[PDB]
């Protein structure tokens, strides 16, 4: 039942990506803006069986789609999501400007920033922890170098195509 | 027997030689492996790890695309290390082995063709590319590799 994943209304933020446990309908469609698979071919997926099939979904900025790939780097890859160096699956994404774009801005979706250590593959960090700072203790915004560790996107009805929101789903196979 | 065992150069595994004719081999301690399961001798060079593939029933790159023995084989297999003759300080790349083919070989079959291997879906008209590989590859021998990566000389008798 992929319709529950590819046709839902509510999606999650990148810092708190959602995981689910479970093909011609996918690769015959033309709406998808990006479709890339690693380690296997989409046309041969019907000729194999696996024990595990995981589905992960979230929303990120259009310019950051390239970061969802093995061996990439950047804020999202360093602190929000991370794929192994020997990943096996597919990455799907499409534009969602008709949704998640309200006059004046949404400010609903967040992304982590200023983390101190890079994430390991397939893990999430949700707890709000002490603010990244320099040598002086901080428990608010009392430090001029003190900063809250989360930020919000500014999706609006009019913006450059690079700043529009995109829905992304990642499929993984393992036996 | 002296000519086959004491020759100066051996053929590549993908181009093994044939020979027909019409004491020292048994007692000599130089033969690391000596096990016996019209006479035709053979000779080639391979890595020490692949010596186990030359036997009735084994599978692998050497047994599938380069040399194959029948299940009802009647003969003996002899092999010895030759690191001090087939290695070089700068590395030797004069030996080759096949790496891609459409189907496995039959017993005592030899293949010398050098056509382009058409991987993928789109065909290629004899021009190598990103999806059309050259089927032959080269070995790398140096005087400092592990015993499993040193060259070995093999002779297999068939009666």
């Amino acid at each position, epitope marked *: 039942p992929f319709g529950e994943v590819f046709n839902a209304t509510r999606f999650a933020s990148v810092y708190a990506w959602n995981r689910k446990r479970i093909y011609s309908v996918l*690769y015959n469609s033309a709406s*998808f803006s990006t*479709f*890339k*698979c*690693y*380690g*296997v*071919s*989409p*046309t*041969k997926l019907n000729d194999l069986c696996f024990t595990n099939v995981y589905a992960d979904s979230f929303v990120i900025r259009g*310019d*950051e789609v*390239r*970061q969802i*790939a*093995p*061996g*990439q*780097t*950047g804020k999202i890859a360093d602190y929000n999501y991370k794929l192994p*160096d*020997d*990943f096996t699956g597919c990455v799907i994404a499409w534009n969602s400007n008709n949704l998640d774009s309200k006059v004046g801005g949404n400010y609903n979706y967040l992304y982590r920033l200023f983390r101190k250590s890079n994430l390991k593959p397939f893990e999430r960090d949700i707890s709000t922890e002490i603010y990244q700072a320099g040598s002086t203790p901080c428990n608010g915004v009392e430090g001029f170098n003190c900063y809250f560790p989360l930020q919000s996107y500014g999706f609006q009805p009019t913006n*450059g195509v*690079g700043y529009q929101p995109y829905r992304v789903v990642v499929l993984s196979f393992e036996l | 027997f002296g000519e086959v065992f004491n020759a100066t150069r051996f053929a590549s595994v993908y181009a093994w030689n044939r020979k027909r004719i019409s004491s020292v081999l048994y007692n000599s301690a130089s033969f690391s492996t000596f096990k016996c399961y019209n006479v035709y001798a053979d000779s080639f060079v391979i890595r020490g790890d692949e010596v186990r593939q030359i036997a009735p029933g084994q599978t692998g790159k050497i047994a599938d695309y380069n040399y194959k023995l029948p299940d009802d084989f009647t003969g003996c297999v002899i092999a010895w290390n030759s690191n001090n003759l087939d290695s070089k300080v*700068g*590395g030797n*790349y004069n030996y080759l082995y096949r*790496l891609f083919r459409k189907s496995n070989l039959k017993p005592f079959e030899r293949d010398i063709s050098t056509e382009i291997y058409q991987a*993928g*879906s*789109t065909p*290629c008209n004899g*021009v*190598e*590319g*990103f*999806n059309c*590989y*050259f089927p032959l*590859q080269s070995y*790398g021998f140096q005087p400092t*590799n*592990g015993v499993g*990566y040193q060259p070995y000389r093999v002779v297999v008798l068939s009666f």
Partner: antibody
Amino acid sequence: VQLQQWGPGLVNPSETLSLTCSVSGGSFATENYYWSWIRQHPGEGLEWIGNIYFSGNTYYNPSLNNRFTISFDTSKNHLSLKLPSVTAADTAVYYCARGTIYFDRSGYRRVDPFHIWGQGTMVIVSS
Amino acid sequence: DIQMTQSPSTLSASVGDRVTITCRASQSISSWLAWYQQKPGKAPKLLIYDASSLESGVPSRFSGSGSGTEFTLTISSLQPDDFATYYCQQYNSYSPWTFGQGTKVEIK
């Protein structure tokens, strides 16, 4: 990830050249990546030497008379370049890079351009 | 087999001006082209790929377009750090890969 290179700076006008490149923070054993060697003559454009893939496959540039050689060393996880009988026209900078391989929706196999580069190495032919 | 041609060989401009560069191919290629920048005495870096896709971390003032046999690189507003050498490279699947001749930019 970072790539480092090791090589000789001087070479006789008739000898064998040997260079080595390595990686840190990752591994060579992966069917997702490929490696290549680029060179640049002083005050000139770039030239592509060839590519090496996981499983030992290789692909060379036909323009060159297959003088070069590329191979792995799994005992050390290195990649090296070999060129015997060097000459005067072999003075240049040498680079090692990496790329990515993926499958398309239609089922074909495509490639991405280089995105990781080494620091380069300079070599001169003495006399 | 396949070959390129860049023009102009050298270009002079000033801060805030518009700059365009053209890479031409001998035979049609299905958008398999990329652009590189190289500072003096440093390793190159990738800016554009697929003739139209922007690389992560590069400024938004860079853009590229074209397909088949003509491609163009455009800079909306030159900054003091944009003076360097640029190269176009193609990675077609039926022929060996090759680089362009390169073009140089300096202050007028």
